[PDB]
Every structure is written in C-alpha cells, then in structure tokens.
Amino acid sequence: KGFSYLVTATTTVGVAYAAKNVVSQFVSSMSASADVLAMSKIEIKLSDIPEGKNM
Amino acid sequence: ELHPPSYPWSHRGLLSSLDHTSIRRGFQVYKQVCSSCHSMDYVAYRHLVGVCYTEEEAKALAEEVEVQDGPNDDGEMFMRPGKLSDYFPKPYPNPEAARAANNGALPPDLSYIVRARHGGEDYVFSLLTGYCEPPTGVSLREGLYFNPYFPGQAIGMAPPIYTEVLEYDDGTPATMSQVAKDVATFLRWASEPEHDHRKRMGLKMLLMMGLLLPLTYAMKRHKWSVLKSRKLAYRPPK
Amino acid sequence: EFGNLARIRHVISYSLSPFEQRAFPSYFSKGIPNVLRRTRERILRVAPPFVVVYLIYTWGNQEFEQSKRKNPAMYE
Amino acid sequence: EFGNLARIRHVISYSLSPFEQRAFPSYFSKGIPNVLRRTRERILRVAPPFVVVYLIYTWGNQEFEQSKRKNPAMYE
Amino acid sequence: SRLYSLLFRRTSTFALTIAVGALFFERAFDQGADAIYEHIN
Amino acid sequence: HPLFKIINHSFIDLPAPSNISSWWNFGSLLGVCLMVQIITGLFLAMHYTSDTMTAFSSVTHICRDVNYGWLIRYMHANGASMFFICLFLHVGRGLYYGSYTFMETWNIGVLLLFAVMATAFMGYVLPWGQMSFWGATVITNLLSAIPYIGTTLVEWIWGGFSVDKATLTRFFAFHFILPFIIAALAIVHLLFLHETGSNNPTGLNSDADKIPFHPYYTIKDILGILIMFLILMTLVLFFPDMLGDPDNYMPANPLNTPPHIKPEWYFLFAYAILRSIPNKLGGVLALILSILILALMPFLHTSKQRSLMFRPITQILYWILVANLLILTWIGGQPVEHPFIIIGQLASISYFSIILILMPISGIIEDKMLKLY
Amino acid sequence: HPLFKIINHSFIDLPAPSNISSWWNFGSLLGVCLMVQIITGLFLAMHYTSDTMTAFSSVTHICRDVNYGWLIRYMHANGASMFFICLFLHVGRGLYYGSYTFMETWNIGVLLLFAVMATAFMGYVLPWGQMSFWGATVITNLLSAIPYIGTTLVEWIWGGFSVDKATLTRFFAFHFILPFIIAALAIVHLLFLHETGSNNPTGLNSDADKIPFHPYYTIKDILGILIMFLILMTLVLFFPDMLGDPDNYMPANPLNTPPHIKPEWYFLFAYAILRSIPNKLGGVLALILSILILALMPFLHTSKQRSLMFRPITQILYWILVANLLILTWIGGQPVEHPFIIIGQLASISYFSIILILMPISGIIEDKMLKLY
Numbered sequence A: 001k002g003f004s005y006l007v008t009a010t011t012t013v014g015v016a017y018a019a020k021n022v023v024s025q026f027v028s029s030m031s032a033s034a035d036v037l038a039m040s041k042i043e044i045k046l047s048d049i050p051e052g053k054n055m
Numbered sequence B: 001e002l003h004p005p006s007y008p009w010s011h012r013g014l015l016s017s018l019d020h021t022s023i024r025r026g027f028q029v030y031k032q033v034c035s036s037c038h039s040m041d042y043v044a045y046r047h048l049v050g051v052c053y054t055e056e057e058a059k060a061l062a063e064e065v066e067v068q069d070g071p072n073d074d075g076e077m078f079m080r081p082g083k084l085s086d087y088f089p090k091p092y093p094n095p096e097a098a099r100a101a102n103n104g105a106l107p108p109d110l111s112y113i114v115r116a117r118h119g120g121e122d123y124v125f126s127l128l129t130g131y132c133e134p135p136t137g138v139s140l141r142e143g144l145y146f147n148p149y150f151p152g153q154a155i156g157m158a159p160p161i162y163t164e165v166l167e168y169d170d171g172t173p174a175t176m177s178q179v180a181k182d183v184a185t186f187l188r189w190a191s192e193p194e195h196d197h198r199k200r201m202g203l204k205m206l207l208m209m210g211l212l213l214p215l216t217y218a219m220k221r222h223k224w225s226v227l228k229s230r231k232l233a234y235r236p237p238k
Numbered sequence C, D: 001e002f003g004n005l006a007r008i009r010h011v012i013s014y015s016l017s018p019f020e021q022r023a024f025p026s027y028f029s030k031g032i033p034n035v036l037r038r039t040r041e042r043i044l045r046v047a048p049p050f051v052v053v054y055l056i057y058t059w060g061n062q063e064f065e066q067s068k069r070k071n072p073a074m075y076e
Numbered sequence E: 001s002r003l004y005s006l007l008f009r010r011t012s013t014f015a016l017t018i019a020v021g022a023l024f025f026e027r028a029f030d031q032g033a034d035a036i037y038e039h040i041n
Numbered sequence F, G: 001h002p003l004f005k006i007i008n009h010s011f012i013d014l015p016a017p018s019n020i021s022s023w024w025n026f027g028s029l030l031g032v033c034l035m036v037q038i039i040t041g042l043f044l045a046m047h048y049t050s051d052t053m054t055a056f057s058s059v060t061h062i063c064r065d066v067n068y069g070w071l072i073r074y075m076h077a078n079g080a081s082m083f084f085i086c087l088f089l090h091v092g093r094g095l096y097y098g099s100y101t102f103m104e105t106w107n108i109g110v111l112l113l114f115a116v117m118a119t120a121f122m123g124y125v126l127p128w129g130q131m132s133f134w135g136a137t138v139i140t141n142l143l144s145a146i147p148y149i150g151t152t153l154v155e156w157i158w159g160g161f162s163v164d165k166a167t168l169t170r171f172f173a174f175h176f177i178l179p180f181i182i183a184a185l186a187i188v189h190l191l192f193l194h195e196t197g198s199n200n201p202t203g204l205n206s207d208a209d210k211i212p213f214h215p216y217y218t219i220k221d222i223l224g225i226l227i228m229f230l231i232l233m234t235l236v237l238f239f240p241d242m243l244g245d246p247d248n249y250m251p252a253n254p255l256n257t258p259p260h261i262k263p264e265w266y267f268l269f270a271y272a273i274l275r276s277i278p279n280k281l282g283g284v285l286a287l288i289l290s291i292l293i294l295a296l297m298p299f300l301h302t303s304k305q306r307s308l309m310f311r312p313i314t315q316i317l318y319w320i321l322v323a324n325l326l327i328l329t330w331i332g333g334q335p336v337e338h339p340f341i342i343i344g345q346l347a348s349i350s351y352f353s354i355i356l357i358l359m360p361i362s363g364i365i366e367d368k369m370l371k372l373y
C-alpha cells in the first residue's frame, strides 16, 4: 500500500506545485502591467502656487 | 526567392538562451546606425533593464534621447527629456515622412522585424550581408539595390553596415558581420523579450510533466490492472 | 444504468486486487512481442497510402522546381 | 408527473368548453364588487405602514431645509 | 511499512503528508531546476 | 442531491465499454481544450481592445508588459491548434469505427464543428495583423459568391464597404460569444449520446462487458489530459511560432496585401478544394460540402458491420482518404502553379469519390465476401 | 426523443398549481429580461471600445451614428432597471409566501442576486462617464476595508494604483462573461425547483389541484411579457432618461468629482446601510448581510403555516419591512446631513430587527393564537 500511495502522494505534490504555479501566473496577469508600474515619475513648480492655494 | 540558410545561433538552441552581450551590442547598432530611419516603437527604455543594461545605464540612455510632445499649461506641446517609461524614438513623424526621407520606400518598424519576416534572424542576416552586385540582365533603378534575399532583390534601403561602421563600446572588432550578427540577435531580442524566460518555463515544465506522466500512467495501470487481470470463464451448466 | 444493461448467463469472472498483483507484469516481456504482433497485422493496410503520399510530395516538389528552372533552349 | 401527483376520492369536477362560454362573464358586473371586496380585506394590513412612510418622508425633507435655514440670531 | 501505517493510511494524514511535502517540494524543485537552467545557459 | 444525480449519471456510474482505446480520450480532451481556450480567452479580454488603431498595440502590450501575458496569448493560439488536432482525430475516430450511426450525436457534432471553425476564423482576424486583414477580406469575399443576396450579406457582415473597424469590433463580440454556445451544444452532444452509450472499437454490442467510469476511465482521461498538456506546453514554450504565420506580426496594411496569403493549416484542406474548383460558386459549395459530406455520412453506411475492425478493404479506402486529406492540406500551402493545381483537382475528386462512391460499394463487396449479401 | 422529453418536462407537461397569482409571472420575466439584456449587450459590443480614450466616444457614436443605436443602448439601460424591478418583486414574493423553505432554490437565488448586482455595477462603470469613474473608485475603495487582504486586492481589481484603463478593460471582460454564468445558475435554479414544484399563495399542498403549463401559464407568461415590454418601451421611448443620472453624460474627469454622487436606485438600500454604520468595516459587513440576511431566512421560519395568506401580524411586519426598505432607498439618495442620517440609522436597525427578531416571535404568537403552540 505504501509504495502505491506514495506514488499517489508524490504525484499530488507535483500537480499541486504546477497548479499553484499556473494559478499564480494568472493572478499575476490581472496584477499591474509593467507599463502601469512605470509611473513613479513626477514634477511640480513651487512658483506655480502662492500661499492659500492648492494645485 | 533565395531561401536564407540556417545559421548556428546560440538562442536557436532548445534549452539555450540569448547571448545578452550580443543583444547589448546590437542595441548599440540600432542606436547609432539604423535608428534614424526605422522605428522600434514597441520597445521602450524600460524593457532593457535587466537584459542588457542596469537601471542607471538605461536611465542615461533614455535621457540622452529627447521627447518632443505632451501638452503644457498653454496646452503647448513641449520637448522634454525621455524617461525609463518612454518608448524608443521614431525615425519619422508620420508614414509620409518615411516615404519622403527614404526615396518613397517605407522602412518598416523593426519593433518586430524578425517575427515579421519568415527567414527571421536568418533572413535579416542574409540580407544585411547579402548585398551584392546585380548580375547581367537585371538592372535596378535609383534607390534600389540587388539584394538576392530581399523580395524582388530590389530593396530601397542602401547597405547600412560598412565594416567599422560603428565602434562597439565593448571593443569587439566591429566587422560588418560581427555587427550584423549582433543586430540580428538584438532584433530577435525585441521580438521576444522573454526568449530566455519562456525557455526556463519550458525546462521546469518538461521536468514536471516528466515526473507526473510516468506516475499518472502507473496509477492508470493500478486502477486498470484489476480488469487487465480479469479472467473470464464460460461454464454452461451442461 | 447498471443492473439493467444486459442478460448473460453462466459466465464466471475471476479477478485480483490491484495491490496483490504486479503493476507491470512482463511489461516488456510480452509487450514488445505484442506491439510487434499488432504492427504486422495492420502495416499493409496503413503504410502504402502514406508511402505514395511521400512519393507524390517529393515528385511535386521536384517537378515544381524543374518547372521553375529556366528553359535553356528558350532565350537563345 | 401527472398521474402520480396525489390521491383524491369522490371529487367530481365539471367544466365547460372555452368557445361555449362567454369570454368575460359579468366582468365588471362582479369584478368591481370583488376587487372592492378584496381591497377592504388587505387595505388595513398594507396601507397603514406606507402611510407612515409618506409622513416620515415629508417630515424629513422639511426638517432638513430648516437646518439649512440661516439662524436669525446667527451673525446678529 | 511504518510510513504507511503512520502517514499514508489515514486519509487525513495522507492529505497532511501531501500538503506538507508539496510545501517543501516547491523549494527543492525550484532550487534544483534553477541550478540546471543556469548551468545550461 | 438532485444535482449530484446528474454527475453520477454522466461521469461516475455511467456504464462505459471496457475495451475503448486511447482515441476515445480525444473528445474529453476537446472539452478540456474548450475550457482552456475560454480561460485563456478571458485573460486576453482584460487587456485586448477591439479598435483598429489599438488592436495590434494591445496585443504587443499583452506580450510585453502584462505579467506572463505572452504565456496566455501563445497558450490561446496553440490551444486553438490543439483544439483542431483533437477535433480532426475525434472526427476520424467517428468515421473509422462507425460511430456516425448515432445520427443525432453526429449531427450535433457537425454543428459544433461549423461553430468551432467560425470561432477560430474570427479569432484569427482579431489581432489585426497583415495576415488577419487580408485573410478576413478573402473569406468574407467568399460570401459574395451567393447568387443573389451575396453582396448584401458580405456588406452586412463587414458592416461597411470593406472590412474595417466595423468588422473588428463585431468579430470581437462574436468570437467572445460563440464558445459558450459551443459549450451548450456540447452539453446537448453529451446528452444525445448517453441515451445510447459510447461505441467500442470492435463495433459490437458491449452490454455484456461494461465498467464504471469514475474509478476506471478517469485516470485514463487524466493521463490523456497530462499528455495533451505536455504537447501543448512544448508547443508554447519551445516552438511558439512553428504553426503560425510570420506575416501576422506586421500591422494590417490595406494598401499592401501579403503576396503569399494562406489560411491557417486546419483550414487548408478546405482551401485546397475551394481553389480547385474553377467556378467561384462551385468552390464555395464544394468547400461547404467538404465539411457537410460528413453529416451526409450516416446515410451512406451500407454494411452489416458497424466498425472497420473486421473490414480490410474499407480500411484501405479509409487510409487512402486520410492520405489525400494530408495531400490537400499540403496543396493548400503550395502556391498557384503547376503541378500543385492538378493534384489539388484530383485530390478533391478522389476525396469526394471515396466518401460518396467507393466506401458503400466496398461495404457491399465485403458483405458479399462473408456470404451475407 | 431525449430533448423533447426534457422539453415536455420543464415547460409543457409540468404540473403547476392552478391558483398562483401574477407575482409568479415575475421570475419568467427575469429570464426574458436576461435574454433581452444579453441580446442588447451583444449589439452594444459590436461598436463599444473598452479604451479610456475612446469609451465615451464609442458610446456617443452608438447613440448618434449607428442606426437605432440609441434604441439598443437605452433598452439595455432601462432593461437593467427592469431586471432589478422584477428581481426585487421576485424576492418579495419569495419572502411573503414562504417560498424560502425550498432552501437549495433560495440559495441558488441569492447567488444569482449577488452575480446580477456585480454585473450591473461593472456595466455601469463601462460607459466611462464622470459618475461611472467616481462610482467605481468609491465602490472599489470599499473593498479597501479589509485590513491585510483588502488593500492589495483593490488595486488588484483596479489592476493598478487607481482605477484607470486597466480597470475598464477587465470590467468589460467580466461584464461580458458573467450573464452567461447567470444563465447557467438560472438553469440550476430551475432544476432545484422542479424537484419540488412551485409554491402557491395559500401555502398549502397543491397536489390535488395542478394543471398543465402550456395552455394555462404560458399564455399568462406571454401576457406578462407583453405588459413588461409595454413598461420598458414606455420607459425608453418616452421617458428614456428617467431612471438614469445626468452627470453620467459628462466625460470621466479624475481631477473633478461629481458634487452629488449616488448609486443607481437599486443599489441604494445597501448604500444607506453602509453609510449608516459608523465603522467602515461595519458598513461593508452590514451591507453584505443586507443581501445575505435573505439566505439566512429559511432558518428563521418558526411557523406551522408556510404562507402569509392566513397570518395577519406577520403580514403587518412584512409591509413594515417593505416600508422601511423604501425608506432606505430614499435615504441613500439624500445627502449626509440631519436628519437623514438618523433615519438611516434607525431604518437599518428596524430592518435587521424585523427580519431577525420580530417575524419568528410573531410566528410563535400566531401559532399560540390558533391553539397550536
């Protein structure tokens, strides 16, 4: 029994490892697209705003 | 049409990846020689990081080039230094401009120049070094060149790679060929930024199926042994 | 469903537990002979159509080439 | 399905053909009385609640406006 | 024989051994696989 | 549970023949491929834009900026190819083993085949490459062949004078919606079959020897799923462009038409037939018949034996049919010039004559040899 | 015939109670509305583009340049409103007549209700107006409630730091794909019901008096379909903008925010509850419970009579529940200021106390009055 089931248990981990990987990559797909991440850029001009104003 | 031969490329390997120094050298070539007329629109300075250049090297490469659009307080489009998010420069503002600055011919975007053509890497190299004198009986008009590989053997593009056309920063002798091989690797790179990665997935995939299949078959054979050993006997009461 | 599928009589059927029998009894012992037995009962029905497909494919290719090859006599 | 739905006994059931009977027998003759019969049977259990709703609605609206209204003493 | 009687005979334990093994298998597989890929290229 | 009954009526306690070979796996593979396509298609739909200015840009954005977006796109394309491989082998199993005598199952099948071909055609139009645009114009033009209402129909589908954005967007909608109709038709396909049960390779009544499915054949479908996934991932991760065309990686230029226009491989057999018939209309009709001849197949069975396991002459004719189907697939690829054309013309004549004439006459001869006729 | 067997079983020879009122029409109307939505949605999908630069332009192009495109768009919007009207009346019929004792049918129902609300939310995001963008942000940031799992999940749906094109395109894909899952869940809904048959307004065993469905409840469903079509069209062709919002006719400005923001009418009752609870998380939970309290409903039935036809005290409590549901619908509309807030807080307290506490106690009292308890 332990020989036959060990094969079932072995296979399971393998499948389990692939299944987490496949499912993982899809979740990553719905995640930020490379381009969207490339937005850390920004600029402002202090002179633009005078006291008591928001921009 | 002449059918470009098969060249022993490293990346052609099944489990072999792209030589990244060759992709860096081929990106230099575009930057200097072929960029002024062709357009790598779908490739941006961001894609290079972790492939050929570091973050600061690609940032310097992007800030050498300059963007010219995007509105301002006056809705005034202005020219600004490009960033890691900006895409590669374009040779001409519009398709017409291309026809105008290239003798009427339109230089195709190289963004995917190789995936586009059939010979792919092989074809590009074949042509790049395939420039040759038109034989007797054939005559080409101005703005045309007899490149056996090019369809019709009349490519508007003049031969762009003269030995020592540009100097490789790495110092590897800039022979015409060394330059054509580097730019073919690079153009390949753009067409598939994941050549290497896909191949890493294919390795692990092979291994995984390599362990799952035999096992699943075994089980298929446990649960089917019962029947495959079944012995039938007919015993008419007689 | 099962129970109402068919009517058989006096057909005894013996079997063994999976764990009690070898998983691959004589797998390559008789498997090879059998696979070979099988191939020789079906090869004459299967193979000669694909053989003449190979001949027609090659022929077409070569014929096409010759067709493309310039007529030396022509243009002279 | 039909035939095995239920067990009844001795319940005779007479009926008429559609084309043999008037389409709208005494439609407004008894319809009105019945509709009126019906409403008085549930009106006390349906309307009362919603009446209070109209009320809360109104009170709510008016109260809000008053809140917006400038306080006379305010600023004076 | 001990293993069967301990972690592979009770289905609950069968699942436990599977899950735990899988949890670690990934570590080992990824590590081993990566070594190979790197060596290749 | 009432729902559980359905499961134990179609997948667990279903009495299946004990001797069905690996070919009977293929239909289940098709169902898996359908789900796979739907799943990958859904993850293409979260980033694809059906605008002619932005369709190629969205596809390149999927391949280059979405995390593992190249993986999902090439899984979708090679899964369409795997779908047609499994579909052709499923139809070949049905033709060889006499499974077309399940007539309702066969007719729902050929309806599913038509729907899958239409879905794959519009899906190939969807990336808006050079090859997609010229391919669409070509087949849409096929409709114009219609004798009287052709022009209108073509213009209707195109939604304008010529394929343009109007088409792309409605092709995106139709390509989205048809695989769910395919799933419903597959449910009807499974129903019309359970009423009769599956066939066996001997073609005999297998009521004396039937086994359960869940414990017995599932591990077989799981193994077939694993092998099909191995072939699909070695198609995606190692040779992602051996089945596609390079000219689809160029943007759609209406001013230039790729000189060599070839429909995708699995449409080739049909393409050959169309090209073979000189008359445009004739080609369209023959093309249709090419697929429809199958539906016509259950009325051509003139033998007293269901399967071809004990029928060697019709086995030879069947393998000649598979042979010239492969020949028609090759010809479609070849350009228009001698002698590719003649082969195409013959191969089409031989295809229709083997299916229509030669197999029932051979079945009559085989019945005469066994002292039955 | 296998199919006709199925057909005859669910629509022709199905034994239905003879005395079911017009309220039992409504579920069939919902199915018709679903098909109508799907059909209109398909004809919106042939011209809509899910790009933030072109979504508003594509919607205006549908309304102005497509032949009868305004008709299909406003039919889609007012058909979503008609769907929620019929859904609310269907749920009210189920609550009043004790139909929640069909527990599996009720649970598949509340799953369908959740799916329909999600579909309508993403569909309202789809035209990319001012109101759609601020509504999406607001309703999505709601998900940002969960402390550890929430924040990331939000941007996950947003597919980025803030809703932007990334969202629009995946919302188009979901909104496309969920009504087919709704159709499959409705098929499961119909199955879990035929096992038990429909209920009657008296709440008694109607096995002694059942009639066919083809000539008796088919022409009745046809008449109900005709009346529902009269109300929809007269809410499209004469009062087309009655149920909508004017600020959705402005383009989506991330820099400005519509001053007065409100969910559409159907989602208000929930909106009120959310606003009522001071704690953000509390609001989200209560909101969910608002819908989920229904699922919980079959375990709260403490009466020996199924229907409310012979139960006057629980009838009074039911109409008070309908009354403060209308009150919560009104409050959601009202802005944040006295005394709208207090009403909202009470109305929510009264809603949960009537469903949770008052109805089983009233059923116990009613059983005591009939000398049963």
Ligand code: HEC
Residues within 6 Å of the ligand: B029, B030, B033, B034, B035, B036, B037, B038, B102, B105, B106, B107, B108, B113, B124, B127, B128, B154, B155, B156, B157, B158, B160, B183
């Ligand atoms: C300064 C001008 C110029 C430079 C530099 C240039 N090209 Fe071109 N190229 C053209 C023009 C013009 C065409 C179009 C010719 C035609 O279509 O007949 C062209 C076409 C091509 C084509 C075939 C596509 C086509 O439409 O002809 C390939 C492949 C190509 N170039 C490769 C390269 C490579 C590789 C480099 C540098 C490593 C390069 N080119 C640099 C002008 C240039």
Ligand code: HEM
Residues within 6 Å of the ligand: F034, F037, F038, F039, F040, F041, F042, F044, F045, F048, F059, F073, F076, F077, F079, F080, F083, F116, F119, F120, F123, F124, F125, F126, F127, F175, F176, F177, F179, F180, F244
């Ligand atoms: C409802 C399920 C499906 C959805 C949502 C879907 C969606 C898409 C989308 C968005 C594309 C464009 C991106 C791309 O180029 O791949 C596409 C392309 C494609 N789809 Fe589908 N699809 C579905 C089902 C199918 C099925 C069942 C088939 C096979 C019959 C199929 C075959 C294709 C093909 C061949 C392409 C073009 C692949 C290429 O670019 O080379 N799709 N699909």
Ligand code: HEM
Residues within 6 Å of the ligand: F023, F024, F025, F026, F027, F028, F030, F031, F034, F087, F090, F091, F094, F099, F100, F102, F105, F106, F109, F110, F112, F113, F116, F182, F186, F189, F193, F197, F198, F199, F200, F294
């Ligand atoms: C949409 C593509 C199809 C799918 C997903 C599909 C799926 C299936 C499935 C799951 C089965 C039951 C499992 C099996 O028999 O192997 C089956 C059986 C069958 N299919 Fe298909 N099928 C498709 C197309 C077709 C076509 C085009 C035909 C006709 C050429 C066809 C004819 C049959 C027949 C005759 C059977 C019964 C086989 C037998 O038991 O002898 N199917 N199909």
Ligand code: HEM
Residues within 6 Å of the ligand: G024, G025, G026, G027, G028, G029, G030, G031, G087, G090, G091, G094, G099, G100, G102, G105, G106, G108, G109, G110, G112, G113, G116, G182, G186, G189, G193, G197, G198, G199, G200, G294
């Ligand atoms: C997708 C929207 C829905 C549709 C199309 C729908 C449709 C139907 C239909 C056609 C019936 C058969 C009753 C009849 O027509 O006479 C029915 C029964 C029922 N539905 Fe719904 N329904 C929907 C949503 C819901 C929801 C959300 C619930 C739960 C709150 C629900 C609970 C029930 C119950 C309990 C029954 C059995 C009542 C009876 O027939 O006596 N349904 N539904």
Ligand code: HEM
Residues within 6 Å of the ligand: G034, G037, G038, G039, G040, G041, G042, G044, G045, G048, G059, G073, G076, G077, G080, G083, G116, G117, G119, G120, G123, G124, G125, G126, G127, G175, G176, G177, G179, G180, G244
């Ligand atoms: C497969 C079925 C469906 C498809 C293909 C579909 C498709 C679409 C498309 C493309 C739009 C954007 C065009 C526009 O807003 O004018 C849209 C909008 C909308 N859809 Fe759907 N839809 C479907 C089902 C539904 C359902 C079931 C509902 C109700 C839950 C719904 C409610 C809406 C709403 C409220 C809008 C926004 C209306 C507005 O702009 O004011 N749709 N639908």
